[PDB]
Design a protein around this ligand. Structure first.
Ligand SMILES: [Mg+2]
Ligand SMILES: [Mg+2]
Ligand SMILES: [Mg+2]
Ligand SMILES: [Mg+2]
Ligand SMILES: [Mg+2]
Ligand SMILES: [Mg+2]
Ligand SMILES: [Mg+2]
Ligand SMILES: [Mg+2]
Ligand SMILES: [Mg+2]
Ligand SMILES: [Mg+2]
Ligand SMILES: [Mg+2]
Ligand SMILES: [Mg+2]
Ligand SMILES: [Mg+2]
Ligand SMILES: [Mg+2]
Ligand SMILES: [Mg+2]
Ligand SMILES: [Mg+2]
Ligand SMILES: [Mg+2]
Ligand SMILES: [Mg+2]
Ligand SMILES: [Mg+2]
Ligand SMILES: [Mg+2]
Ligand SMILES: [Mg+2]
Ligand SMILES: [Mg+2]
Ligand SMILES: [Mg+2]
Ligand SMILES: [Mg+2]
Ligand SMILES: [Mg+2]
Ligand SMILES: [Mg+2]
Ligand SMILES: [Mg+2]
Ligand SMILES: [Mg+2]
Ligand SMILES: [Mg+2]
Ligand SMILES: [Mg+2]
Ligand SMILES: [Mg+2]
Ligand SMILES: [Mg+2]
Ligand SMILES: [Mg+2]
Ligand SMILES: [Mg+2]
Ligand SMILES: [Mg+2]
Ligand SMILES: [Mg+2]
Ligand SMILES: [Mg+2]
Ligand SMILES: [Mg+2]
Ligand SMILES: [Mg+2]
Ligand SMILES: [Mg+2]
Ligand SMILES: [Mg+2]
Ligand SMILES: [Mg+2]
Ligand SMILES: [Mg+2]
Ligand SMILES: [Mg+2]
Ligand SMILES: [Mg+2]
Ligand SMILES: [Mg+2]
Ligand SMILES: [Mg+2]
Ligand SMILES: [Mg+2]
Ligand SMILES: [Mg+2]
Ligand SMILES: [Mg+2]
Ligand SMILES: [Mg+2]
Ligand SMILES: [Mg+2]
Ligand SMILES: [Mg+2]
Ligand SMILES: [Mg+2]
Ligand SMILES: [Mg+2]
Ligand SMILES: [Mg+2]
Ligand SMILES: [Mg+2]
Ligand SMILES: [Mg+2]
Ligand SMILES: [Mg+2]
Ligand SMILES: [Mg+2]
Ligand SMILES: [Mg+2]
Ligand SMILES: [Mg+2]
Ligand SMILES: [Mg+2]
Ligand SMILES: [Mg+2]
Ligand SMILES: [Mg+2]
Ligand SMILES: [Mg+2]
Ligand SMILES: [Mg+2]
Ligand SMILES: [Mg+2]
Ligand SMILES: [Mg+2]
Ligand SMILES: [Mg+2]
Ligand SMILES: [Mg+2]
Ligand SMILES: [Mg+2]
Ligand SMILES: [Mg+2]
Ligand SMILES: [Mg+2]
Ligand SMILES: [Mg+2]
Ligand SMILES: [Mg+2]
Ligand SMILES: [Mg+2]
Ligand SMILES: [Mg+2]
Ligand SMILES: [Mg+2]
Ligand SMILES: [Mg+2]
Ligand SMILES: [Mg+2]
Ligand SMILES: [Mg+2]
Ligand SMILES: [Mg+2]
Ligand SMILES: [Mg+2]
Ligand SMILES: [Mg+2]
Ligand SMILES: [Mg+2]
Ligand SMILES: [Mg+2]
Ligand SMILES: [Mg+2]
Ligand SMILES: [Mg+2]
Ligand SMILES: [Mg+2]
Ligand SMILES: [Mg+2]
Ligand SMILES: [Mg+2]
Ligand SMILES: [Mg+2]
Ligand SMILES: [Mg+2]
Ligand SMILES: [Mg+2]
Ligand SMILES: [Mg+2]
Ligand SMILES: [Mg+2]
Ligand SMILES: [Mg+2]
Ligand SMILES: [Mg+2]
Ligand SMILES: [Mg+2]
Ligand SMILES: [Mg+2]
Ligand SMILES: [Mg+2]
Ligand SMILES: [Mg+2]
Ligand SMILES: [Mg+2]
Ligand SMILES: [Mg+2]
Ligand SMILES: [Mg+2]
Ligand SMILES: [Mg+2]
Ligand SMILES: [Mg+2]
Ligand SMILES: [Mg+2]
Ligand SMILES: [Mg+2]
Ligand SMILES: [Mg+2]
Ligand SMILES: [Mg+2]
Ligand SMILES: [Mg+2]
Ligand SMILES: [Mg+2]
Ligand SMILES: [Mg+2]
Ligand SMILES: [Mg+2]
Ligand SMILES: [Mg+2]
Ligand SMILES: [Mg+2]
Ligand SMILES: [Mg+2]
Ligand SMILES: [Mg+2]
Ligand SMILES: [Mg+2]
Ligand SMILES: [Mg+2]
Ligand SMILES: [Mg+2]
Ligand SMILES: [Mg+2]
Ligand SMILES: [Mg+2]
Ligand SMILES: [Mg+2]
Ligand SMILES: [Mg+2]
Ligand SMILES: [Mg+2]
Ligand SMILES: [Mg+2]
Ligand SMILES: [Mg+2]
Ligand SMILES: [Mg+2]
Ligand SMILES: [Mg+2]
Ligand SMILES: [Mg+2]
Ligand SMILES: [Mg+2]
Ligand SMILES: [Mg+2]
Ligand SMILES: [Mg+2]
Ligand SMILES: [Mg+2]
Ligand SMILES: [Mg+2]
Ligand SMILES: [Mg+2]
Ligand SMILES: [Mg+2]
Ligand SMILES: [Mg+2]
Ligand SMILES: [Mg+2]
Ligand SMILES: [Mg+2]
Ligand SMILES: [Mg+2]
Ligand SMILES: [Mg+2]
Ligand SMILES: [Mg+2]
Ligand SMILES: [Mg+2]
Ligand SMILES: [Mg+2]
Ligand SMILES: [Mg+2]
Ligand SMILES: [Mg+2]
Ligand SMILES: [Mg+2]
Ligand SMILES: [Zn+2]
Lengths: 138, 99, 124, 208, 151
RNA sequence: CAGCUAGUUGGUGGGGUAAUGGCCCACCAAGGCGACGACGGGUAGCCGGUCUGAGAGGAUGGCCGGCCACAGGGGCACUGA
RNA sequence: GGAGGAAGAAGCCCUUCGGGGUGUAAACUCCUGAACCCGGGACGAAACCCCCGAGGAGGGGACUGACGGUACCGGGGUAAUAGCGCCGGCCAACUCCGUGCCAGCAGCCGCGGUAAUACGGAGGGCGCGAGCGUUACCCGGAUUCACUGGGCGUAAAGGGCGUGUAGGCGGCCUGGGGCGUCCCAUGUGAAAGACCACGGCUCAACCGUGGGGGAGCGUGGGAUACGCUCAGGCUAGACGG
RNA sequence: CUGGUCCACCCGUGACGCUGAGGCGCGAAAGCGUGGGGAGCAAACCGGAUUAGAUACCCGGGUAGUCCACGCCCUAAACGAUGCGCGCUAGGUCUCUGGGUCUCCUGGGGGCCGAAGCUAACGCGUUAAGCGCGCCGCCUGGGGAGUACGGCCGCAAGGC
RNA sequence: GAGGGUAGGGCCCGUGACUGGGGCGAAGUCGUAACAAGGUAGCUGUACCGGAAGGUGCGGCUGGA
RNA sequence: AAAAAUGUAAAA
């Protein structure tokens, strides 16, 4: 039955990226779109689109990576260095406008659900609003 | 102003008086989880028109009796016995906690 | 644990007891020296330690260690308790102040006169 | 107050030519030019690389002794520095330099940093009129650090001024040698200064 | 030809019929005090010689460190299994406030304003490893948008 | 410390006060409270503040300021705004 | 007290007996001048009180100082108290004699049983200074009650296993509400404090003056993303044939 | 007589779910209670031998118990020393069982070796000790001590 | 209606002949059970028994081969 | 599958 679709979703990315897959699927959902919407706006995913898994609306998240590396164990760079959820179904994390975190001194982004939509760590600040801290990415 | 609460009638076994439960949720002072606690209030119903399980509103009013400083307002919905259960069942289990 | 576990149970407060039962943690306690005897040290050492039981005025009765080279405390001496155990003597958890009351200081001592209660001399 | 004890003896500890005196220290005898090794029976023995803290300590004591001021006040200013914004590091040295008696040295009135204290103490120095005797007193930007009237025609004073003819001093300072008075233009930028000490280390130390 | 400085020199031994011979180990780090720094741990049956080995071993390894007027670009939680160290960029005039080991690391890294602390284990050797790989994960503004570009 | 409650919970009528009110009285109805910790025991005046600490937190309430309570222990009412 | 002042007194300690150390330290020269002396000597005080007007407004006149003959100002003026802790590692500071598991130190590990940098004395050094140091208690280090920020195969720790009550958590889509939450406005959060700024007392401490935003709570308005709530639909979870 | 479990057909229901303080039930062996049974085995106990000693190791004999019924006890290295559930993350190999025009494919279960990854190491690794969410359980130096007191359960031993 | 008095319960503290175990100790006595098949693999719940560690029984676990 | 007990108390 799962709990937070987002939680396991971000994990799809994580586990996939770790093994360097082309892309991975995940049950289609409103919020997940918003997630990828911003997860592409800032540039962490090649893109996405609704697909089919035996009459089951999924979502193909096409992963992005880095250039090939020289030296021992040619490990391709990770575009998504790290992505972890903050507002858990256990602890609903609500932050104020002048409380929104600064992911790794700007280098990162804080995907959160504002009261007027969904914005980045900076985008939410610009519009001057706060919301549920979905997760951070860097 | 005159504080008003939206609770449920959980006890109507008194004269012109009715007990009402009120659940209020809020972030934990340290752990920020949306915890939920409650309390029982004794309302003044000179009409007795409000029955059990009747979700009603209560307003901070003139002292009626000892542990009674509130009065009823209006019904929100009649059939709500299911909630009454949650209260009753909690009571039951208590009897099986002692010795 | 989980969040709810904390919501309910909660982190247990540390709380530590004192290494010295000297009442109001008073800097020093006054008492009358009852026994003045020398006890042998513990495991790695052996050097007859000059100790003295002191029946406090605060109703207690403990053993205290006399530093310095010798002393002058008999069966009725009065004295102060510094508070500080000796890892070489089992039970002794209170030092005994020098130069205070019936307890004289140390003779001949030069350095560290403070601890051993010895008013500075004059060379001239 | 200041440690009255032998001073040209500390020059040897820091291992750096420190001008705690006046003429003699410029002479062929800062007392280290003679004995480039720390005091004590030892010193003339192969030592060992101190610990991080140890170096930070020695390094600090270098700066402190330089201004011959109580560690109490010394520390109190370190805090005063952290208190405000700016590059706390240089700022410290900054306020250190803003000390009245100190400016009296960097203005020539006195031959030694210690002799400066003495003069300033006896009110031999004035500021905008007031005979400020307080060796402390942080001289704000823009002041008349002149010499008191009675103190004007003084033997020791003259000697100091006469020798202080020309000789550029304090880019952030002016000097009306004619009337025996000086001014504090601006706050001495870090670059302008140049002490044999490393501020960064002195900073790290007081963070414990 | 960068600036060289060691961390610690322990003395490990070996049980064996008769006596207990030894083998010294020295941790050494190098750097020009500006982005270029390398760490090497040289082991040898002799204190000086070990340092000598540590020399080549250190001058071997190395890592770029995107400075910033003396400070580090960003903060990072680098866990090296046992130990756990975190660095954070400070405002000029702060100071290299770090553990004994990471101190001489960033010091030769041309760092002057950094906030660090050791967590979990504090084993000198491990801590060192951590600090290095840590700098090895550092990413400049350029580095970021570079990989994020991929046009 | 796991069950507690007879003015106990509520109602009608009354007393009493500047005033609401079991605050108190007579009569009537069985209710009232509790593991969201009742009842018991222990300890303690509360806050503004103070101490420490990267912060969160922890510790604390001397001085000054605000509210409270007591004036040898304990009870009472008179005078009066 | 300040400046100077020996290839460097005397004594004291060390020594490969050459010399090294105390150490510019002192002696001594010269300059200043705390203490002390003489003279002067406050602010804090203005108002109630008197007068014209109208007994007011406005305006003009008059009394009072505990501290105090104090602070402060001018002049005359003598080099004028220094102490405490530490010196094995942590931790900054090394050597000599005495002692011999004694004496005795000890915060942690430990030291002492003939050559102790660890006991005691000394020489010397290190730190600090009218203070130094001990004891006591609080926070810290302690990410060792872990929200930030721990962990549970063998190191402390999975309940012996199942059933289920409370409670906690909640699959994809559409709709109203707007409880949580988010934003604006506003009442509030008094003074003292903390911080920033300027200023007062020779500086500071102390203090005056002004500026800042503050959590939370009260009211009004706004939004709807996820949580919540009522309502409609689906089949990917669970169930059933 | 009866529980659980798996595969195929995608037929019905329509979020009905996960977890689970207390509680309720089960719970090896030994043990207790009334009654029944008793071959072999077998604490205790008797004897022989070894040994300085030998209340033991081995040998000879032997009771309770082991078995049935009904009732109570409720502990264990109850061990994978690894709580329960849903999701994602190479694969090679053999074995139990189920579906299918089948030198092979597909679902559930058991065991070895290993990608990535975690780990103090060992070692784990689609049967995780991996990556992530939800809930209960629990730990916070050793000894003292699973003791002492209190409370509850039991005929008792003793247990929580 | 303060308090006083009488009778009876609850909780807490101190104390007590004697007694139970525990901690502690440069040395004792008696054995040797444990770590190597520790010279009977060990551990373990329970039971019985013995100067003592411990042995033996019923079952169980490897942290045995 | 191997009959046979025990070494107190001062330094890295
Ligand atoms: Mg690829
Ligand atoms: Mg796309
Ligand atoms: Mg409600
Ligand atoms: Mg009434
Ligand atoms: Mg009434
Ligand atoms: Mg004597
Ligand atoms: Mg006497
Ligand atoms: Mg020169
Ligand atoms: Mg002072
Ligand atoms: Mg100059
Ligand atoms: Mg000069
Ligand atoms: Mg003068
Ligand atoms: Mg001065
Ligand atoms: Mg100039
Ligand atoms: Mg310039
Ligand atoms: Mg200079
Ligand atoms: Mg600090
Ligand atoms: Mg500090
Ligand atoms: Mg770790
Ligand atoms: Mg009555
Ligand atoms: Mg009435
Ligand atoms: Mg009435
Ligand atoms: Mg009255
Ligand atoms: Mg009434
Ligand atoms: Mg009534
Ligand atoms: Mg009745
Ligand atoms: Mg409570
Ligand atoms: Mg009390
Ligand atoms: Mg009290
Ligand atoms: Mg902290
Ligand atoms: Mg602070
Ligand atoms: Mg008082
Ligand atoms: Mg009195
Ligand atoms: Mg009285
Ligand atoms: Mg009274
Ligand atoms: Mg009156
Ligand atoms: Mg001199
Ligand atoms: Mg004068
Ligand atoms: Mg005058
Ligand atoms: Mg006047
Ligand atoms: Mg007037
Ligand atoms: Mg009057
Ligand atoms: Mg008139
Ligand atoms: Mg008139
Ligand atoms: Mg008048
Ligand atoms: Mg006078
Ligand atoms: Mg004068
Ligand atoms: Mg004068
Ligand atoms: Mg003169
Ligand atoms: Mg002189
Ligand atoms: Mg002199
Ligand atoms: Mg003179
Ligand atoms: Mg010290
Ligand atoms: Mg020493
Ligand atoms: Mg010494
Ligand atoms: Mg040292
Ligand atoms: Mg002796
Ligand atoms: Mg000593
Ligand atoms: Mg020890
Ligand atoms: Mg000797
Ligand atoms: Mg020796
Ligand atoms: Mg010594
Ligand atoms: Mg020492
Ligand atoms: Mg010592
Ligand atoms: Mg000395
Ligand atoms: Mg503490
Ligand atoms: Mg803490
Ligand atoms: Mg702990
Ligand atoms: Mg721990
Ligand atoms: Mg602790
Ligand atoms: Mg831990
Ligand atoms: Mg364990
Ligand atoms: Mg289990
Ligand atoms: Mg439920
Ligand atoms: Mg909705
Ligand atoms: Mg509508
Ligand atoms: Mg609306
Ligand atoms: Mg809100
Ligand atoms: Mg809020
Ligand atoms: Mg506001
Ligand atoms: Mg507000
Ligand atoms: Mg305001
Ligand atoms: Mg406030
Ligand atoms: Mg205000
Ligand atoms: Mg305020
Ligand atoms: Mg400002
Ligand atoms: Mg100013
Ligand atoms: Mg000012
Ligand atoms: Mg000021
Ligand atoms: Mg001023
Ligand atoms: Mg000023
Ligand atoms: Mg003020
Ligand atoms: Mg203000
Ligand atoms: Mg302003
Ligand atoms: Mg709020
Ligand atoms: Mg069946
Ligand atoms: Mg069957
Ligand atoms: Mg099929
Ligand atoms: Mg079909
Ligand atoms: Mg279907
Ligand atoms: Mg169907
Ligand atoms: Mg349907
Ligand atoms: Mg279940
Ligand atoms: Mg039950
Ligand atoms: Mg049962
Ligand atoms: Mg049985
Ligand atoms: Mg039987
Ligand atoms: Mg029996
Ligand atoms: Mg038979
Ligand atoms: Mg017989
Ligand atoms: Mg036999
Ligand atoms: Mg037999
Ligand atoms: Mg029997
Ligand atoms: Mg059978
Ligand atoms: Mg059983
Ligand atoms: Mg267990
Ligand atoms: Mg299930
Ligand atoms: Mg098959
Ligand atoms: Mg299938
Ligand atoms: Mg399989
Ligand atoms: Mg394996
Ligand atoms: Mg690998
Ligand atoms: Mg590893
Ligand atoms: Mg490995
Ligand atoms: Mg697998
Ligand atoms: Mg698989
Ligand atoms: Mg597999
Ligand atoms: Mg314990
Ligand atoms: Mg037990
Ligand atoms: Mg008991
Ligand atoms: Mg148990
Ligand atoms: Mg009565
Ligand atoms: Mg009575
Ligand atoms: Mg009685
Ligand atoms: Mg009684
Ligand atoms: Mg008793
Ligand atoms: Mg006893
Ligand atoms: Mg007896
Ligand atoms: Mg025992
Ligand atoms: Mg013994
Ligand atoms: Mg004996
Ligand atoms: Mg023994
Ligand atoms: Mg055995
Ligand atoms: Mg074995
Ligand atoms: Mg074994
Ligand atoms: Mg057994
Ligand atoms: Mg088994
Ligand atoms: Mg084998
Ligand atoms: Mg065999
Ligand atoms: Mg023996
Ligand atoms: Mg031995
Ligand atoms: Zn010099």
């Amino acid at each position: 039955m799962l709990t937070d679709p987002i939680a396991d979703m971000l994990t799809r990315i994580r586990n996939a990226t770790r093994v360097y897959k082309e892309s991975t699927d995940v049950p289609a959902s409103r919020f997940k779109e918003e997630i990828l919407r911003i997860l592409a706006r800032e540039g962490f995913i090649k893109g996405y689109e609704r697909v089919d898994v035996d009459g089951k609306p999924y979502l193909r998240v096409y992963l992005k990576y880095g250039p090939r590396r020289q030296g021992p164990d040619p490990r391709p760079e990770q575009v998504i260095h790290h992505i972890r959820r903050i507002s858990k179904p256990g602890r609903r994390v609500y932050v104020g406008v002048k409380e929104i975190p600064r992911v790794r001194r700007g280098l990162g982004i804080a995907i959160l659900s504002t009261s007027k939509g969904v914005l980045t760590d900076r985008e939410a600040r610009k519009l001057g609003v706060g919301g549920e801290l979905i997760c951070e990415v860097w | 102003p005159k504080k008003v609460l939206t609770g449920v009638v959980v006890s109507d076994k008194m004269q012109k008086t009715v007990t009402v439960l009120v659940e209020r949720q809020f972030p934990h002072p340290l752990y920020g989880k949306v915890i939920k606690r409650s309390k029982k209030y004794l309302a003044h119903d000179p009409e007795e028109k409000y029955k059990l399980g009747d979700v009603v509103e209560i307003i901070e009013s003139r002292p009626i009796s000892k542990r009674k400083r509130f009065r009823v307002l209006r019904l929100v919905e009649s059939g709500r016995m299911d909630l009454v259960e949650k209260y009753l069942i909690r009571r039951q289990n208590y009897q099986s906690l002692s010795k | 644990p989980t969040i709810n576990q904390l919501v309910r149970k909660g982190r247990e407060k540390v709380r530590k007891k004192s290494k010295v039962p000297a009442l109001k943690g008073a800097p020093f306690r006054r008492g009358v020296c009852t026994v003045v005897r020398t006890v042998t040290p513990k495991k790695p050492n052996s050097a007859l330690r000059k100790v003295a039981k002191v029946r406090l005025t605060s109703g207690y009765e403990v053993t205290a260690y006399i530093p310095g080279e010798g002393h002058n405390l008999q069966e009725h001496s009065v004295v102060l308790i510094r508070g500080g155990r000796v890892k070489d003597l089992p039970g002794v958890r209170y030092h005994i102040v020098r130069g205070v009351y019936d307890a004289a200081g140390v003779k001949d001592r030069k350095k560290s006169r403070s601890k051993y209660g010895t008013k500075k001399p004059k060379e001239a | 107050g200041r440690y009255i004890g032998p001073v040209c003896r500390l020059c040897r500890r820091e291992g750096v030519k420190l001008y705690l005196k006046g003429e003699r220290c410029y002479s062929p005898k800062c007392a280290m030019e003679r004995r480039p090794y720390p005091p004590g029976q030892h010193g003339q023995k192969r030592a060992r690389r101190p610990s991080d803290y140890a170096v930070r300590l020695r390094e600090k004591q270098k700066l402190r002794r330089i201004y011959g001021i109580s560690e109490r006040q010394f520390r109190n200013l370190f805090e005063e520095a952290s208190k405000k914004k700016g590059v706390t590091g240089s700022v410290f040295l900054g306020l250190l330099e803003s000390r009245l008696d100190n400016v009296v040295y960097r203005l020539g009135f006195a031959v030694s940093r210690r002799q400066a204290r003495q003069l300033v103490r006896h009110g031999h120095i004035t500021v905008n009129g007031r005979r400020v005797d307080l060796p402390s007193y942080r001289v704000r930007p823009g002041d008349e650090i002149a010499v008191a009237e009675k103190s004007r025609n003084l033997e020791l004073i003259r000697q100091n001024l006469e020798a202080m003819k020309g000789r550029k001093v304090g880019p952030w300072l002016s000097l009306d040698v004619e009337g025996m008075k000086g001014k504090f233009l601006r706050l001495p930028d870090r670059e302008d200064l140049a002490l044999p000490v490393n501020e960064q280390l002195v900073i790290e130390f007081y963070s414990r | 030809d960068f600036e060289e400085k060691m961390i610690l020199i322990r003395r490990t031994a070996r049980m064996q019929a008769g006596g207990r011979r030894f083998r010294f180990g020295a941790l050494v780090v190098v750097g020009d005090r500006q982005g270029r720094v390398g760490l090497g741990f040289g082991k040898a049956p002799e204190v000086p010689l070990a340092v000598q080995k540590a020399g080549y071993y250190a001058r071997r390894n190395m890592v770029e460190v995107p400075l910033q007027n003396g400070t580090i670009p960003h903060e990072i939680e680098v866990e090296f299994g046992a130990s756990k160290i975190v660095l954070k960029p400070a405002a000029p005039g702060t100071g290299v406030i770090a553990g004994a080991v990471p101190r001489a690391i960033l010091e030769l890294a041309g760092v002057t304003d950094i906030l660090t602390k050791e967590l979990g284990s504090r084993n000198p050797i491990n801590i060192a490893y951590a600090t290095m790989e840590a700098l090895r994960q550092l990413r400049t503004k350029a580095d970021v948008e570079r990989l994020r570009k991929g046009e």
